[PDB]
Amino acid sequence: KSAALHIDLCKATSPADALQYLLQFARKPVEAESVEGVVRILLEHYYKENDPSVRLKIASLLGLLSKTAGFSPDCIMDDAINILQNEKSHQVLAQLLDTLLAIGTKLPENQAIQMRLVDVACKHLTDTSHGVRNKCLQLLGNLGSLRDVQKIIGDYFSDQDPRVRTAAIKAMLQLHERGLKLHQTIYNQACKLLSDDYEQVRSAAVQLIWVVSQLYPESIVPIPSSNEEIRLVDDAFGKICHMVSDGSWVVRVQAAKLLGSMEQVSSHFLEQTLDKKLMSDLRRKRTAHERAKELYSS
């Protein structure tokens, strides 16, 4: 049926006729060898079509076809990369980057993944596009190694949009969860953004502070900061406490779980805790006792 589909796509009367047909095709599943068929055809159409709307869905279709169990996304990653270089609207590019991420995870081979990562570092530098930036951070995070990647992500830590800030934090967080070891540079960066205006950002920030805290409890912060030198974990515990007393109801939830999960806090600081500031919203209240008991054992 592969060559019939070809014909139907061009025969579209108007731009929005084309759009619907693609949409309808989305809803019928495609087998291993027909997915190869349609990918090619849909790329061809993409070249020749001047309306973004249709380009965007073509990209979505492409992603769906990438995700097919039988399908192996080879001989058409190069094509994807080629189209990236010579595309012009940020939305479509972001969608294609998403497709690329899907492709990356589909096959775990070292070489192609690295290629894709480099491509997305290139696309990471995109300007006044909140969305290409976010997609890029996601993909870097997803396809990343095991150092350069980690260093890159801090650049976008300090970005105009809080929406990019969050993505960066989550990306680092992701890198941890695939067995990597973050640096103390990352720790300092996380402490620097714990007190941003946006609620999202703060949520993510403590998440990370906790992450790096568990990574380096033994390590110490030399900086006195108006007191004598104390442990990294000590300070992390402190910063997470502050958040319990922060002006949001969901920021506190972030803190509570992490505060409870903290280990090898000094007996002094652990005793001193203002975890008895449980108030207002009764969800937080209930949550903060749960882990209390888990770690009263400790």
Binding site: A16, L23, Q91, D98, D161, Y198
Partner: protein, 603 residues
């Protein structure tokens, strides 16, 4: 700006606005005509359903999963609800969801628990709760009976072509899904942040959204999305006059660059007041003859308006001792909200109700669809008696679909639909004053209604683009100018250097550096273009003042040349062109450049 339209129905729109680098899903709606399409599901097994035949579709294939009632096919699966297409735009990229009315906010939990989306829904406090108890009501009804085991098995195109008219006209067949669980409901309600009216909730320091009062039932919140330059206003469930709820904020909706109007009368010939009156007459008549009365209604909005009139008629007619028995699980809650912001309500049928049941009564039941709920069962009991009546107060569902499976019913059937939502005349008068440049509204409004030939259709001077399902329509606005504040201690001073060209125009050379913090712009201090003409006489005099000797001026085509013979220099002076020609003497060049520049404006 691109607005993606993701739902067909005028009533529930789900229209996604990509704007100023931030995308918004203006509503999330569950249609429910698909559900009216399936065969009704009773709380207790009904003889009819068990003994129903097939429709003999034949052509091989299915005789199990298609039935026939009064020459109309139904399907022997659980009612499946049509939901807004998810494919045309990714949900992720639609950032926050705004939700207007509690009736229009169903299908929120579908999307949030099924297809990936990590944003914050903004909905005013009343609507959230009303919508919460309404979905809980819905979930209870479909899960009261577990008959969802069966599969529809009719979705195939081929099957649709051959089968008869009632099923044939499904705009989408493949997107139908069985109802979500109470967990998804919970997730949805959790993500809603409760935002009061006229509250300027700003998203990501980009655009400012605020829920204005709409005039319709409690929680009805039309929205305005402005950015300091373009005001886009979204106008759903925005009944003008409906008594108690705070009225429509026309003035706040005024001078909007782009108005989206979607909520509008389901019935254009609504005549609200008259229908309320007729309703109550009919009810009275039937209770007088001793037959029972059945009303299929929802747990908010129309229910309370009809209750206040009934009481008044009873006071005026002295038709007491007729129990007004409201039967629904969330009846408890429903009355509670009325309090917060001779009728006896029973959450459980076959309970308090059974013990207290009296021979005549007016029972306001579970669902207007007549497929899922308690209405079904009472409908069956009272069907076989001519005496007993059913009044359809609800516009959502056409008179005739309910009648369809239960076509051989003795009950006198009355239609009394009441819609408080703006009429087309009301919408026409609204839009003259509000005065918006482009308006986007569904095809349905664009053309006159199928039923009536008459030209009641919604028309504006600008000839407004008609929406449609799966239609991504781009309106004609490019952003031209965006705000940027100036610094106090460092910048203001240096950037307060105006040089007057005209009486009412000034010009200041601004040099600074911009920090783009949280998507806001602030310029603070860390070769110009030239314009003008060189008056030759005054230029030579300037040269003479600075000691240059032996100056000669000659006329040339289109200008003059000034010859500085003592300095081996030529200055060609033409319109918008000065050419200094000299030896490689940088000091001399600089001195002449400076003397020339004094005669030119710097930009």
């Amino acid at each position: 700006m691109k607005l993606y339209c993701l739902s067909g129905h005028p009533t529930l729109p789900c229209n996604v606005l990509k704007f100023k680098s931030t995308t918004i899903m203006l509503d999330c709606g569950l249609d429910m005509t698909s559900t009216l399409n399936f065969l009704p599901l009773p709380l207790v097994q009904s003889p009819r359903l068990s003994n129903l035949p097939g429709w003999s579709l034949k052509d091989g294939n299915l005789d199990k999963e298609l039935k026939e009632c009064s020459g109309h096919v139904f399907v022997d699966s659980v009612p499946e609800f049509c939901l807004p297409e998810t494919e045309l735009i990714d949900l992720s990229t639609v950032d926050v969801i705004l939700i207007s009315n509690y009736h229009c906010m169903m299908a929120l939990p579908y999307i949030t628990e099924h297809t990936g989306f990590t944003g914050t829904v903004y909905a005013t406090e009343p609507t959230v709760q009303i919508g919460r108890l309404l979905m809980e009501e819905l979930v209870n009804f479909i899960e009261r009976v577990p008959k969802a085991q069966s599969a529809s098995l009719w979705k195939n195109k081929d099957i649709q072509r051959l089968l008869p008219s009632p099923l044939k006209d499904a705009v989408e067949v493949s997107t139908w899904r069985r109802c979500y669980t109470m967990q998804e409901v919970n997730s949805a309600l959790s993500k809603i942040q409760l935002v009061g009216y006229s509250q300027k909730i700003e998203l990501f320091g980009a655009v400012q959204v605020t829920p204005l009062s709409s005039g319709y039932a409690l929680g009805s919140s039309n929205w305005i999305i402005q950015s300091h330059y373009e005001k886009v206003s979204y106008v759903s469930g925005s009944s003008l006059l409906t008594t108690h709820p705070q009225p429509m904020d026309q003035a706040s909706l005024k001078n909007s660059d782009v108005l989206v109007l979607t909520g509008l009368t389901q019935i254009p010939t609504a005549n609200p007041d008259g229908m309320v009156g007729e309703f109550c007459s009919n009810l009275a008549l039937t209770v007088r003859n001793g037959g029972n009365v059945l009303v299929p209604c929802y747990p908010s909005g129309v229910i309370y308006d009809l209750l206040e009139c009934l009481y008044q008629y009873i006071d005026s007619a002295g038709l007491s001792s007729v129990p007004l028995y409201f039967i629904s699980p969330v009846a408890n809650s429903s009355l509670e909200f009325s309090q917060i912001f001779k009728l006896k309500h029973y959450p459980s049928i076959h309970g308090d109700f059974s013990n207290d049941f009296r021979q005549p009564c007016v029972v306001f039941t579970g669902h207007p669809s007549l497929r899922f709920g308690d209405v079904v069962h009472f409908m069956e009991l009272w069907g076989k008696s001519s005496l007993n009546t059913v009044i359809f107060t609800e516009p959502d569902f056409s008179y005739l679909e309910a009648l369809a499976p239960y076509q051989p019913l003795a009950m006198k059937c009355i239609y009394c639909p009441i819609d408080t939502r703006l009429n087309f005349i009301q919408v026409s008068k609204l839009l003259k004053e509000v005065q918006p440049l482009h308006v986007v509204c569904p095809e349905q409004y664009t053309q006159p209604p199928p039923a009536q030939s008459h030209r009641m259709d919604l028309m504006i001077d600008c000839q407004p683009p008609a929406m449609s399902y799966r239609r991504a329509e781009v309106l004609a606005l490019p952003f031209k100018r965006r705000y940027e504040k100036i610094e106090i201690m460092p910048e203001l001073a240096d950037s307060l250097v105006p040089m007057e060209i005209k009486p009412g125009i000034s010009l200041a050379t601004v040099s600074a550096v911009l920090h783009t913090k949280d998507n806001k712009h602030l310029l603070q201090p860390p070769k110009p273009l030239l314009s003008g003409s060189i008056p030759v006489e005054q230029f030579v005099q300037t040269l003479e003042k600075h000691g240059f000797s032996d100056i000669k001026v000659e006329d040339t085509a289109k200008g003059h040349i000034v010859l500085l013979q003592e300095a081996e220099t030529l200055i060609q002076i033409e319109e918008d062109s000065t050419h200094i020609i000299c030896d490689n003497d940088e000091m001399l060049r600089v001195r002449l450049r400076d003397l020339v520049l004094k005669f030119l404006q710097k930009f």
